[PDB]
Amino acid sequence: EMEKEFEQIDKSGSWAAIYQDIRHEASDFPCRVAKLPKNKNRNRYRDVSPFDHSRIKLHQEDNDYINASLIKMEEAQRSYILTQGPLPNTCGHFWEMVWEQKSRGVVMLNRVMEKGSLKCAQYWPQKEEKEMIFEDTNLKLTLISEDIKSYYTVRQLELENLTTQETREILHFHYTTWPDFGVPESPASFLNFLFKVRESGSLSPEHGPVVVHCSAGIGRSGTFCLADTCLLLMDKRKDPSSVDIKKVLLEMRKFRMGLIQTADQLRFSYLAVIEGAKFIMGDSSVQDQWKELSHEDL
Ligand SMILES: O=C1C[C@@H](c2ccc(C[C@H](NS(=O)(=O)c3cccc(C(F)(F)F)c3)c3nc(Cc4ccccc4)c[nH]3)cc2)S(=O)(=O)N1
Ligand SMILES: [Mg+2]
């Protein structure tokens, strides 16, 4: 039924109309804290703000603001923190959030520079011997190792609370070829990556919410979370054909504005879920097929 709906949307050529209807029906909640004058330099984009009700609060008394939102999907039983690409002055805040929320994984879907423009600060160390210290938050971050694939890289980071000396291993899943306002090369390349994150254990409820970000934390980040959530629901319900992706996206938009930024990212989300359903329904060949198709060992 999901592919029947997909098939009729394609035949009618109504992706833009469907997507615009979602934009029109999406929740509108205040973002008063994000808009306070003192928080202007903590926001990368003036039109992308976290709603007050779902924003992540830093545990510091000075200013607890960070442009990050808790997306809590009740039925799917999974939470995600979606945030913008950190700014030069909010990298300490970013890691303080990771620490305080007890996240185990960070999913990055953009590159630091895209088409001649900075989209995110270099918030993690590129070299083992050049660790980073965020003085304002008292955290130390070290690159332990990295596994570089053709379109994505997985890194092992060690985050240390300098005050208590406790250290934690943080896994960084960096998708390096997802164009801004665009889509992955194929459902296979997207799913291969998603399942790598799932298999790492990072999404387990024993850990805090995975932190997902792109440049604004809504387009690419929204696509990633929508597909994951829909696949979770299909695996959970007695009838996987009951999953209404448009309803799931409207639910996600109650927690952060603008998730899914183009009609084609919405269409791609359908393809990813339709393709991923094969695995949910049993198929044990699709995963290797996805890896092969993704050409990750290029
Ligand atoms: O696939 C994506 C889209 C990126 C993205 C999404 C939103 C923004 C916020 C920008 N604010 S602004 O300070 O660059 C900006 C730009 C224009 C107007 C504007 C106001 F509405 F006037 F505030 C703000 C931004 N770019 C547009 C382009 C766009 C146009 C039509 C439909 C969809 C997107 C709209 N807002 C930046 C990156 S992502 O990193 O979330 N992944
Ligand atoms: Mg070296």
User: What distance, in Å, lies between the first and last C-alpha atoms of the chain?
Assistant: 36
Nearest ligand 1 atom to the CA of 215 is 40
Q: By the 8 A CB rule, do 209 and 77 touch?
A: no
91 is catalytic: no
Q: Is the dihedral of CA 58, 62, 65, 66 positive or negative?
A: negative
**Cβ of 105: how many Cβ atoms within 10 Å?**
23
Measured by CA distance, the residue closest to atom 21 of ligand 1 is 47
Q: 107 CA distance to ligand 2 centroid (A)?
A: 23
Q: Cα–Cα distance between 178 and 291 in angstroms, integer?
A: 17
Give the position of tokens 């790598």: 196
Q: Identify the CA nearest to 194 among candidates 218, 216, 178.
A: 178
Q: By the 8 A CB rule, do 295 and 208 touch?
A: no
81 is in an annotated binding site: no
Q: By the 8 A CB rule, do 166 and 150 touch?
A: no
Q: 126 CA distance to ligand 2 centroid (A)?
A: 8
Instruction: Give the domain ranges of the chain.
Output: 1-298
Q: Identify the CA nearest to 99 among candidates 173, 218, 205, 209.
A: 209
Q: 252 CA distance to ligand 1 centroid (A)?
A: 19
Q: Is the dihedral of CA 91, 93, 99, 105 positive or negative?
A: negative
Resolution (A): 1.8
Nearest ligand 1 atom to the CA of 178 is 1
Q: 109 CA distance to ligand 2 centroid (A)?
A: 24
Q: Identify the CA nearest to 76 among candidates 216, 220, 255.
A: 255
Q: Cα–Cα distance between 212 and 224 in angstroms, integer?
A: 8
Ligand 1 first shell, C-beta below 6 A? 45-48, 110, 180-181, 214-220, 261
Distance of CA 212 to the CA centre of its chain: 3
Query: Ligand 1, from 15, 19, 45: best to mutate by most atoms within 8 Å of Cβ?
Result: 45
Q: By the 8 A CB rule, do 219 and 262 touch?
A: yes
Catalytic residue among 120, 214, 225, 230: 214
Query: Is 1-298 a CATH 3.40.50.300 domain?
Result: no
State which approach was used to obtain the coordinates. X-ray
